[PDB]
Scaffold this motif. Structure first.
Motif, PDB file in Angstrom:
ATOM      1  N   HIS A  90       0.850  -1.187   0.000  1.00 12.49           N
ATOM      2  CA  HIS A  90       0.000   0.000   0.000  1.00 12.49           C
ATOM      3  C   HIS A  90       0.887   1.238   0.000  1.00 12.49           C
ATOM      4  CE1 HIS A  90      -2.936  -2.845   2.278  1.00 12.49           C
ATOM      5  NE2 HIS A  90      -2.991  -3.047   0.974  1.00 12.49           N
ATOM      6  N   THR A  91       0.907   1.959  -1.124  1.00  7.59           N
ATOM      7  CA  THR A  91       1.786   3.106  -1.290  1.00  7.59           C
ATOM      8  C   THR A  91       1.065   4.446  -1.312  1.00  7.59           C
ATOM      9  OG1 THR A  91       1.712   2.781  -3.693  1.00  7.59           O
ATOM     10  CG2 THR A  91       3.551   1.790  -2.497  1.00  7.59           C
ATOM     11  N   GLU A  92      -0.246   4.464  -1.529  1.00 13.18           N
ATOM     12  CA  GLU A  92      -0.996   5.704  -1.678  1.00 13.18           C
ATOM     13  C   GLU A  92      -1.745   6.030  -0.393  1.00 13.18           C
ATOM     14  OE1 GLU A  92      -0.952   7.850  -4.179  1.00 13.18           O
ATOM     15  OE2 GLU A  92       0.503   6.629  -5.277  1.00 13.18           O
ATOM     16  N   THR A  93      -1.617   7.273   0.055  1.00 14.05           N
ATOM     17  CA  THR A  93      -2.284   7.732   1.268  1.00 14.05           C
ATOM     18  C   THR A  93      -3.706   8.181   0.948  1.00 14.05           C
ATOM     19  OG1 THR A  93      -0.234   8.403   2.364  1.00 14.05           O
ATOM     20  CG2 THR A  93      -2.271   9.473   3.065  1.00 14.05           C
ATOM     21  N   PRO A  94      -4.714   7.655   1.637  1.00 11.13           N
ATOM     22  CA  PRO A  94      -6.090   8.096   1.389  1.00 11.13           C
ATOM     23  C   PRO A  94      -6.317   9.524   1.860  1.00 11.13           C
ATOM     24  CG  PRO A  94      -6.013   6.610   3.259  1.00 11.13           C
ATOM     25  CD  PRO A  94      -4.648   6.581   2.641  1.00 11.13           C
ATOM     26  N   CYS A  95      -7.361  10.139   1.310  1.00 11.69           N
ATOM     27  CA  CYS A  95      -7.745  11.499   1.658  1.00 11.69           C
ATOM     28  C   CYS A  95      -9.228  11.545   1.995  1.00 11.69           C
ATOM     29  CB  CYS A  95      -7.440  12.473   0.515  1.00 11.69           C
ATOM     30  SG  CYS A  95      -7.655  14.216   0.937  1.00 11.69           S
ATOM     31  N   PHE A  96      -9.567  12.295   3.043  1.00 17.34           N
ATOM     32  CA  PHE A  96     -10.949  12.474   3.472  1.00 17.34           C
ATOM     33  C   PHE A  96     -11.240  13.963   3.568  1.00 17.34           C
ATOM     34  CE2 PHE A  96      -9.654   8.345   5.081  1.00 17.34           C
ATOM     35  CZ  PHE A  96     -10.702   7.536   4.699  1.00 17.34           C
ATOM     36  N   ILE A  97     -12.278  14.411   2.867  1.00 21.95           N
ATOM     37  CA  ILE A  97     -12.690  15.809   2.858  1.00 21.95           C
ATOM     38  C   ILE A  97     -14.087  15.891   3.454  1.00 21.95           C
ATOM     39  CG2 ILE A  97     -12.999  17.883   1.473  1.00 21.95           C
ATOM     40  CD1 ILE A  97     -10.154  16.845   1.556  1.00 21.95           C
ATOM     41  N   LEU A  98     -14.257  16.760   4.446  1.00 21.91           N
ATOM     42  CA  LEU A  98     -15.487  16.842   5.217  1.00 21.91           C
ATOM     43  C   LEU A  98     -16.120  18.218   5.063  1.00 21.91           C
ATOM     44  CD1 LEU A  98     -14.303  15.071   8.499  1.00 21.91           C
ATOM     45  CD2 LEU A  98     -15.516  14.068   6.554  1.00 21.91           C
ATOM     46  N   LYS A  99     -17.452  18.243   5.014  1.00 24.51           N
ATOM     47  CA  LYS A  99     -18.212  19.492   4.955  1.00 24.51           C
ATOM     48  C   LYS A  99     -18.417  19.989   6.384  1.00 24.51           C
ATOM     49  CE  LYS A  99     -22.543  21.453   3.173  1.00 24.51           C
ATOM     50  NZ  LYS A  99     -21.927  22.600   2.452  1.00 24.51           N
ATOM     51  N   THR A 100     -17.359  20.577   6.936  1.00 24.90           N
ATOM     52  CA  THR A 100     -17.374  21.060   8.310  1.00 24.90           C
ATOM     53  C   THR A 100     -16.381  22.208   8.437  1.00 24.90           C
ATOM     54  OG1 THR A 100     -17.242  20.399  10.636  1.00 24.90           O
ATOM     55  CG2 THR A 100     -15.612  19.471   9.124  1.00 24.90           C
ATOM     56  N   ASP A 101     -16.330  22.799   9.631  1.00 22.42           N
ATOM     57  CA  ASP A 101     -15.469  23.935   9.906  1.00 22.42           C
ATOM     58  C   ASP A 101     -14.151  23.475  10.528  1.00 22.42           C
ATOM     59  OD1 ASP A 101     -16.479  23.135  12.321  1.00 22.42           O
ATOM     60  OD2 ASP A 101     -17.504  25.020  12.780  1.00 22.42           O
ATOM     61  N   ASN A 148       0.227  18.437   0.800  1.00 18.47           N
ATOM     62  CA  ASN A 148       0.553  17.633  -0.369  1.00 18.47           C
ATOM     63  C   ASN A 148       1.907  16.936  -0.280  1.00 18.47           C
ATOM     64  OD1 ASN A 148       2.379  19.703  -0.783  1.00 18.47           O
ATOM     65  ND2 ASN A 148       1.420  20.479  -2.656  1.00 18.47           N
ATOM     66  N   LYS A 149       2.511  16.861   0.903  1.00 20.60           N
ATOM     67  CA  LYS A 149       3.793  16.180   1.035  1.00 20.60           C
ATOM     68  C   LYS A 149       3.586  14.673   1.141  1.00 20.60           C
ATOM     69  CE  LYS A 149       4.176  16.707   6.084  1.00 20.60           C
ATOM     70  NZ  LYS A 149       4.983  17.295   7.189  1.00 20.60           N
ATOM     71  N   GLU A 150       4.513  13.920   0.564  1.00 22.12           N
ATOM     72  CA  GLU A 150       4.426  12.463   0.571  1.00 22.12           C
ATOM     73  C   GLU A 150       5.010  11.911   1.868  1.00 22.12           C
ATOM     74  OE1 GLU A 150       2.953  10.480  -1.625  1.00 22.12           O
ATOM     75  OE2 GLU A 150       2.329  12.193  -2.848  1.00 22.12           O
ATOM     76  N   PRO A 151       4.343  10.957   2.514  1.00 20.72           N
ATOM     77  CA  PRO A 151       4.865  10.418   3.774  1.00 20.72           C
ATOM     78  C   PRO A 151       6.155   9.637   3.572  1.00 20.72           C
ATOM     79  CG  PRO A 151       3.016   9.111   3.020  1.00 20.72           C
ATOM     80  CD  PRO A 151       3.092  10.298   2.104  1.00 20.72           C
ATOM     81  N   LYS A 152       6.986   9.640   4.610  1.00 16.19           N
ATOM     82  CA  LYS A 152       8.246   8.911   4.601  1.00 16.19           C
ATOM     83  C   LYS A 152       8.051   7.529   5.211  1.00 16.19           C
ATOM     84  CE  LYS A 152      11.506  11.588   2.829  1.00 16.19           C
ATOM     85  NZ  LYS A 152      10.594  12.763   2.797  1.00 16.19           N
ATOM     86  N   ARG A 153       8.678   6.526   4.603  1.00 14.54           N
ATOM     87  CA  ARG A 153       8.507   5.138   5.003  1.00 14.54           C
ATOM     88  C   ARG A 153       9.832   4.532   5.442  1.00 14.54           C
ATOM     89  NH1 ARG A 153       3.373   2.882   3.162  1.00 14.54           N
ATOM     90  NH2 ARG A 153       2.399   4.363   1.714  1.00 14.54           N
ATOM     91  N   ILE A 154       9.789   3.795   6.549  1.00 10.22           N
ATOM     92  CA  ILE A 154      10.895   2.956   7.002  1.00 10.22           C
ATOM     93  C   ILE A 154      10.340   1.541   7.085  1.00 10.22           C
ATOM     94  CG2 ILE A 154      12.720   2.619   8.688  1.00 10.22           C
ATOM     95  CD1 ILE A 154      12.240   5.473   9.638  1.00 10.22           C
ATOM     96  N   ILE A 155      10.695   0.701   6.108  1.00 10.58           N
ATOM     97  CA  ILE A 155      10.101  -0.630   6.016  1.00 10.58           C
ATOM     98  C   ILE A 155      10.557  -1.511   7.172  1.00 10.58           C
ATOM     99  CG2 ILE A 155       9.739  -2.608   4.507  1.00 10.58           C
ATOM    100  CD1 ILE A 155      10.426  -0.813   2.143  1.00 10.58           C
ATOM    101  N   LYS A 156      11.821  -1.382   7.581  1.00  9.84           N
ATOM    102  CA  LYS A 156      12.342  -2.229   8.650  1.00  9.84           C
ATOM    103  C   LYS A 156      11.606  -1.985   9.961  1.00  9.84           C
ATOM    104  CE  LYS A 156      16.599  -3.403  11.123  1.00  9.84           C
ATOM    105  NZ  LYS A 156      18.006  -2.998  11.394  1.00  9.84           N
ATOM    106  N   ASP A 157      11.321  -0.726  10.279  1.00 17.14           N
ATOM    107  CA  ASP A 157      10.627  -0.371  11.509  1.00 17.14           C
ATOM    108  C   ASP A 157       9.112  -0.432  11.378  1.00 17.14           C
ATOM    109  OD1 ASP A 157      13.257   0.154  11.972  1.00 17.14           O
ATOM    110  OD2 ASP A 157      12.985   2.222  12.658  1.00 17.14           O
ATOM    111  N   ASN A 158       8.589  -0.738  10.188  1.00 15.23           N
ATOM    112  CA  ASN A 158       7.147  -0.752   9.929  1.00 15.23           C
ATOM    113  C   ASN A 158       6.519   0.594  10.287  1.00 15.23           C
ATOM    114  OD1 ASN A 158       5.194  -2.909   8.922  1.00 15.23           O
ATOM    115  ND2 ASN A 158       4.052  -2.097  10.676  1.00 15.23           N
ATOM    116  N   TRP A 159       7.089   1.663   9.734  1.00 21.34           N
ATOM    117  CA  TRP A 159       6.711   3.025  10.084  1.00 21.34           C
ATOM    118  C   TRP A 159       6.375   3.828   8.837  1.00 21.34           C
ATOM    119  CZ3 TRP A 159       8.654   8.178   9.788  1.00 21.34           C
ATOM    120  CH2 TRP A 159       8.035   9.071  10.669  1.00 21.34           C
ATOM    121  N   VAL A 160       5.240   4.523   8.878  1.00 18.71           N
ATOM    122  CA  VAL A 160       4.868   5.527   7.891  1.00 18.71           C
ATOM    123  C   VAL A 160       4.579   6.819   8.640  1.00 18.71           C
ATOM    124  CG1 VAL A 160       3.497   5.988   5.830  1.00 18.71           C
ATOM    125  CG2 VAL A 160       3.774   3.636   6.632  1.00 18.71           C
ATOM    126  N   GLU A 161       5.001   7.949   8.063  1.00 22.99           N
ATOM    127  CA  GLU A 161       4.919   9.222   8.775  1.00 22.99           C
ATOM    128  C   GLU A 161       3.477   9.570   9.128  1.00 22.99           C
ATOM    129  OE1 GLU A 161       6.700  12.448   6.676  1.00 22.99           O
ATOM    130  OE2 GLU A 161       6.713  13.792   8.411  1.00 22.99           O
TER     131      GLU A 161
END
Lengths: 430, 430
Positions: A310-321, A354-367
């Protein structure tokens, strides 16, 4: 309010009589004789309902008019086997049958009210003077005539044609009724005894029965006002069965349509590297605030759990303040879910969203695992700058400012999070 | 029957006003001013409901009393921005707003009825004679006094304090209402406009709303009689949801419900790294003492066996005392199962219960495989500090002290360990 409560009490008493009656009993709501006319094979029961919650102690004068009315009816219908019942409630009077003596009846016949004297006492006690008879026979009576009649009936001793002893012994009974709450509880218990659950009686059966009694009461035709226990039971059972059938068929059609939509959407959800955006209107989903965090958690657990696939980060846009967005950010952080909003305070920043998250596969970490923001102009410019693969719209949000050229749009018609999870193949069956 | 029909017409008018009002409008059933008191942000609307089905044509005398009472209320509350409405139905009168001229109002104030003169006309038109004022101030008035007051008000020309022109222009409106059937049909159509089907409105929604209006009408407290469109809609929706759930249940047998629950639970159980917590009351599980150890052993064999894949330790919280926990710990040690209780004697330890087990993958060793304790306050604090992914409740144990925000609560209704194993997908068939 007192008259409405009294009418409700009368309706409850009629319903209690209907439930307690046998299948061979024809009961006329708002009958010719009294409020409740129960016609058996040989005996007709007439019940007069009165409500006196505001009276501390029962008094004889409180029941002058109904007693005189039933006395006149017995005088006019002595040959008929009609039993007259007086059902009046008094807070400080013990519930049960209360005896009325002949002396009390005679005291009623000596009432000084002109209306009672002219209407019932005159027929019960005919005047021995022709002048008084002529005065009583006048359709319109002047004040002098009223005073003369009142004085004559107060001063003259007149015999009673009505057999007081026989009426009291056979055709009369006086019962102190229960309270409105107690009568309603007894009626509900009687409804429960017919095979209906307490919740069913409280929600459907009792209001339907009350409405049925009220509708039959207002009918000018007396024949249409004749009802029975079997008719009411059949009506309630038919209503319940029809409601069950409708609520099953509608759900069946809804499930078929939702299955069609889910099979339409399933091909694109199995690809591990698609950018999916969700535009959600919180007012079209029930319990959005309480369930939004868990929905996003489940979506991340299914579609954004594998660090290498899974390489793509989902996006959620809400009709709120913005403030609601900050509260959602607080709740997400409290649950150890990393999201990005693009807002520092009340200002939006292009380079953060719009910045892309950083991944460390060994640590199982996504920003960060998701993007969550509002439908402001800057956020929509961010969306237009980086076009998505699939664009899901929930709640009919106005997407007129989005650039939708060559973007796969999937309009979702849901009203709860269970349906949304079912459509996105996060549940097996609703 | 006419009075009951009029009361039902008033209830239908109140329901129609509630449905047609906005979410910001407060409506008082049987309000202080009139039957319907609609309170907006700045204007209070008072509606008087009158039913005149038995009258061939509308007459001015038919509305003497409501108009006089309304004028008296306006005189006593001239500074308040209250709009008064008269809702009267006449079969032969066109439905719509009917204008009442100043001459008609003056004719109302000249009525010969003593009751109106003594109650409302006297305050609207004060008497210029102190003797008449003293007579009107008497609690009990003799016939001679009544005749004197009537003659004085018929013969004397008295000025009107109430501003008739301003009242008619701004605070007065007279509308000929629809028929009872037409009003009921309009109310039902408004109910359908809220998303309800016609059959649902006919069977459940309309009788429930009528019962709600009737129940609120009889409340002696004015504050408790205030309702709103949102409250009624929520009440109807809750009743419909409860009826739907109850009628969907009780049709399928025990096994079908258990299968549905199992299929609901499976997707979360299919994940390898979820923290799952159990809260169990031993009194609602048959043969708990004999079978608890075997159930935990099977659960660990199913969900906590793979050392590399299963990384979360299950937690079992029981409703018992410390001594029973020590006995269970003895029985677990006897069967080569490593658990931690957080208790050393009779003292709980926070750091002894929240520690993470150590793993040696080469030796296939995990320090402990489960956490088993009691539902004490310190333990509840420990679970609250480290929230879980799934929270399973077995026995309806009180979880008030738990912080249940953004957690998946899954109530399981069982009576033996076989059903629990079946629900947790560790048995194929009961």
């Amino acid at each position: 309010d007192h008259t409405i409560k009294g009418f409700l009490y009368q309706f409850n008493k009629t319903l209690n009589s209907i439930l307690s009656s046998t299948d061979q009993d024809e009961i006329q709501i708002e009958g010719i004789i009294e409020d409740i006319d129960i016609k058996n094979s040989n005996i007709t029961n007439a019940i007069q309902c009165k409500y006196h919650e505001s009276k501390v102690r029962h008094n004889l004068s409180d029941i002058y008019k109904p007693i005189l009315q039933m006395l006149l009816h017995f005088l006019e219908n002595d040959s008929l086997n009609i039993k007259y019942a007086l059902y009046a409630y008094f807070p400080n009077e013990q519930v049960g049958v209360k005896e009325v003596t002949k002396s009390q009846i005679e005291e009623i016949l000596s009432s000084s009210n002109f209306d009672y004297i002219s209407k019932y006492i005159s027929k019960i006690k005919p005047p021995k003077e022709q002048i008084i008879k002529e005065l009583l026979g006048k359709t319109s009576k002047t004040t002098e005539d009223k005073t003369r009649i009142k004085k004559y009936y107060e001063t003259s001793k007149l015999e009673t044609i009505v057999d007081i002893d026989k009426f009291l012994r056979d055709h009369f009974v006086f019962e102190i009724g229960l309270s409105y709450e107690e009568l309603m509880n007894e009626t509900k218990n009687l409804l429960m005894k017919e095979g209906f659950s307490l919740e069913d009686v409280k929600d459907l059966f009792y209001p339907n029965s009350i409405q049925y009694i009220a509708e039959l009461s207002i009918l000018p035709e007396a024949e249409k006002r004749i009802s029975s226990k079997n008719k009411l039971i059949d009506y309630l059972k038919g209503n319940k069965k029809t409601a069950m059938s409708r609520w099953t068929s509608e759900v069946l059609t809804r499930k078929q349509l939702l299955k069609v939509r889910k099979n339409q959407l399933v091909p694109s959800l199995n690809i591990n590297s698609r950018s999916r955006y969700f535009i959600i209107d919180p007012d079209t989903i029930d319990n959005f605030d309480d369930e939004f965090i868990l929905f996003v958690k489940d979506y991340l657990d299914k579609y954004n759990s594998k660090i290498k696939l899974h390489t793509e980060t989902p996006c959620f846009i809400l009709k709120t303040d913005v403030n609601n967005l900050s509260e959602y950010h607080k709740r997400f952080v409290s649950r150890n879910i990393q999201i990005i909003t693009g807002y520092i305070g009340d200002t939006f920043y292009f380079k953060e969203f719009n910045k892309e998250p950083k991944r460390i596969i060994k640590d199982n970490w996504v920003e960060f695992k998701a993007r969550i923001s509002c439908n402001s102009d800057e956020v929509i410019k961010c969306i237009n700058y980086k076009k998505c693969d699939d664009l899901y719209i929930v709640g009919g949000v106005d997407v007129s400012l989005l650039d939708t050229a060559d973007v796969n749009i999937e309009n979702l018609e849901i009203n709860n999070f269970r349906e949304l999870k079912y459509l996105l193949s996060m549940l097996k069956e609703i």
